[PDB]
């Protein structure tokens, strides 16, 4: 009945907004401190805000149905039609996207294959390229269930159609800021990440993408609020909270020493106190440990530089 965390070293966990395990762990006051993320969100109560999916493989991968037309563009842009990954159709609602849909502007590079149903089938793969940021003349609109993805100057002449699946592979001109979910109108989203007390700087698990550029690659750092095992844990257990905070201690594993005290709030994040100027990283082999509940404002044991 008492709440609890998994006994798993953060270096052994999946991620939330890009399917690749966690590498770093760092706090930062400099970067924007008011992210409005959608993927990887959960109430320790047990519900699922935003578009947060359940599995790990359902991150930024949308199913659809393909169909083309040759009038404008030009591109030879395709035209998908969103349905939920399980197979059942999709009708708009509270969430601003199907389950598991990207939430970061830029220019993705998806990889699309034919949905499989039984052995001995025939498959076709391709490599499209879409835009998610605030770009006009190709009005993007997942909320209705309609996206516009171009085609790359590459292997071709037998494209795909029918029932597809779109796993991502790359990025271009990354810009962490929510895409245009509806065509400019409003959609029922998840609240900002907050609020915060003088002496508050969110804790960010950090993984590295692959950022294509002019004939070279370059890693790029992207964050989340919690690894995916936390989501799969909470959403399956459905505990019951007392007030708002839940103070933890990031305990090392060999010695038994301490590294900070982190106020795991109720609304799904792990705040902290750090009054430095630059960034600051922490080792990534420790373990989390539940200690107690408390109120919101339980003063912090600041672990600074």
């Amino acid at each position, epitope marked *: 009945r008492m709440v609890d965390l998994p006994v798993i070293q953060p270096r052994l966990c999946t991620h939330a907004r890009w399917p690749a395990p966690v590498y770093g762990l760092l706090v930062d006051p400099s970067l924007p401190s008011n992210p409005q993320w959608q993927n990887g969100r959960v109430h320790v109560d047990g519900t699922l805000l935003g578009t947060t999916p359940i599995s790990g493989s359902w991150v930024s991968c949308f199913a659809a149905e393909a169909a*083309y037309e*040759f*009038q404008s563009g*030009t591109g*030879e842009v395709a035209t998908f039609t969103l349905i939920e990954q399980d197979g059942s159709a999709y009708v708009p609602g509270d969430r601003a996207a199907p389950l598991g849909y990207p939430d970061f502007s830029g220019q993705l590079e998806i990889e699309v294959q034919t949905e499989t149903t039984k052995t001995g089938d025939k498959l076709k793969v391709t490599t499209f390229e879409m835009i998610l940021g605030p770009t006009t003349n190709a009005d993007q609109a997942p909320y209705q269930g309609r996206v516009f993805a171009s085609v790359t100057a*590459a*292997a*071709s002449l037998d*494209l795909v159609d029918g029932r597809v699946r779109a796993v991502p592979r790359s990025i271009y001109g990354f810009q962490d800021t929510i895409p245009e979910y509806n065509d400019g109108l409003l959609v029922p989203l998840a609240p900002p990440i907050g609020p915060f007390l003088p002496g508050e700087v969110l804790l960010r698990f950090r993984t590295y993408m692959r950022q294509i550029d002019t004939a070279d690659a370059a890693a790029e750092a992207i964050d989340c609020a919690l690894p995916q095992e936390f989501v799969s844990w909470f959403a399956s257990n459905a505990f019951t909270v007392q007030s708002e905070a839940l103070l933890l201690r990031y305990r090392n594993t060999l010695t038994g020493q301490l590294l900070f005290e982190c106020k795991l709030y109720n609304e799904g994040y792990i705040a902290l106190s750090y009054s430095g100027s630059g960034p600051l990283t922490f080792p990534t082999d420790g373990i989390f440990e539940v200690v107690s509940w408390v109120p919101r404002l339980y003063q912090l044991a600041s672990v600074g530089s």
Partner: antibody, heavy 118, light 107 residues
Framework: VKLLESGGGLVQPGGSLKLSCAASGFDFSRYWMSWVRQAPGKGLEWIGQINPHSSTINYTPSLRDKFIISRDNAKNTLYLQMTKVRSEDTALYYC????????????WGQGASVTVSS | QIVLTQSPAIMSASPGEKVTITCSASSSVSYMHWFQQKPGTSPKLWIYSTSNLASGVPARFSGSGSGTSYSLTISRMEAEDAATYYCQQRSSYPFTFGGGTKLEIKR
């Protein structure tokens, strides 16, 4: 969305020629291309097709060894090369802007007239 | 290596009538296209995937058929429907055009 050709003229048997189909008004470095010919009288005839990367190039089985298709993205043009031309291979030559899913050669140029002569 | 046959080679009619044109197949195919070449002019795409209309055609025309025999039919002819019509198949092999038939005015 406008094309053009050059190189039409006179050649002798066994000779060689370089037709240049130029394009304008669209992303020429993204679409496949193809060539088809019409002898005076008889119906159309397919030559082949070339993708943008020059990766794969499909020729008709016959008369492969006499035709060399290629392109250039920088100067934004397309080249067809005839070698050891014979007398029977005089016709009009068109360069089409083939399409992706439904193959559908849609936009055609103007016409290159090629005639062997003595 | 599929060869096609268009029939008949040349045939005419008078406005207001309905005509049909068949382009048969020597083997199983799955789609055909239709082009229209007025004399002294580069051809133009007319009907793709055996059933759809190109960009800028009057809605008189009609494409149908399936299996190994397709055909193109007009509802009512006109004075702007006189040109050679070619059938192409994008099925499986080095593509092939049909022999091509003509369709002109009857006076």
């Amino acid at each position: 969305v406008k094309l053009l050709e050059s190189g039409g003229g006179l050649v002798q048997p066994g000779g060689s020629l370089k037709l240049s189909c130029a394009a304008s008004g669209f992303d020429f470095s993204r679409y496949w291309m193809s060539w088809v010919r019409q002898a005076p009288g008889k119906g159309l005839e397919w030559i082949g097709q070339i993708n943008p990367h020059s990766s794969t190039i499909n020729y008709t089985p016959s008369l492969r060894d006499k035709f060399i298709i290629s392109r250039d993205n920088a100067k934004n043009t397309l080249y067809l090369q005839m070698t050891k031309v014979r007398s029977e291979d005089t016709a009009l030559y068109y360069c089409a802007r083939l399409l992706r899913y439904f193959y559908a050669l849609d936009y055609w140029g103007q016409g290159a007239s090629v005639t062997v002569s003595s | 290596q599929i060869v096609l046959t268009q029939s008949p080679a040349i045939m005419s009619a008078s406005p207001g009538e309905k005509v049909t044109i068949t382009c048969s197949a020597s083997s199983s195919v799955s789609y055909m296209h239709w082009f229209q070449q007025k004399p002294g002019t580069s051809p133009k795409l007319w009907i793709y995937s055996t059933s759809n209309l190109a960009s800028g055609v009057p809605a008189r025309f009609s494409g149908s058929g399936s299996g190994t025999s397709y055909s193109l039919t007009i509802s009512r002819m006109e004075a702007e429907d006189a040109a050679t019509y070619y059938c192409q198949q994008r099925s499986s092999y080095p593509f092939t055009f049909g022999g091509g038939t003509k369709l002109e005015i009857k006076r």
